[PDB]
């Protein structure tokens, strides 16, 4: 069998690789032993990229999340908890990046993605990014100077991915 089969990545550092890519797409190709979500800390996947995993899975993420936090309560603003990939990925690794926009601390972005750390290969989008509104640019620097594992991170939009990897050396 074909698992973490990941192709057509832009290698940035030793560790960090990139692709403008459907993250659902190539948890689906690549068929990886971890996706990232880029969740909140009550695991509630209404938009982004955790309402496009959730409804991949036909919501089965969703009720899964809903009996996590039943049992656990909410993870914390930089924390992580790991349950089902369902038909995406073997886990899924739920992370807490900050959200500016509902006013969070940013200096935690660090702190979320020191959660990849305990993954030897993930695949993953930038934390803290998009509807979270975090700066990317700002999220992969954090990115490569905090992951020592192997990330492969899908950017959706070409002219985001485009922007990235042209400021990032």
């Not at 690794?93 to 940013?106: A, R």
């Not at 930038?126 to 192997?150: E, K, M, Q, W, Y």
Request: aromatic share 8%; proline share 3%.
């Amino acid at each position: 069998s074909m698992v973490n089969s990941f192709s057509g990545y832009l290698k940035l550092t030793d560790n960090v690789y990139i692709k403008n890519a459907d993250i659902v797409e190539e948890a689906k190709k690549v068929k990886p032993t971890v996706v990232v979500n880029a969740a909140n800390v009550y695991l509630k996947h209404g938009g982004g990229v955790a309402g496009a995993l959730n409804k991949a899975t036909n919501n089965a993420m969703q009720v899964e999340s809903d009996d996590y936090i039943a049992t656990n309560g909410p993870l914390k603003v930089g924390g992580s908890c790991v349950l089902s990939g369902h038909n995406l990925a073997k886990h899924c690794l739920h992370v807490v990046g900050p959200n500016v926009n509902k006013g969070e601390d940013i200096q935690l972005l660090k702190s979320a993605y020191e959660n990849f750390n305990q993954h030897e290969v993930l695949l993953a989008p930038l934390l803290s990014a998009g509807i979270f509104g975090a700066d990317p640019i700002h999220s992969l620097r954090v990115c490569v100077d905090t992951v020592r594992t192997n990330v492969y991170l899908a950017v959706f939009d070409k002219n985001l991915y485009d922007k990235l990897v042209s400021s990032f050396l």
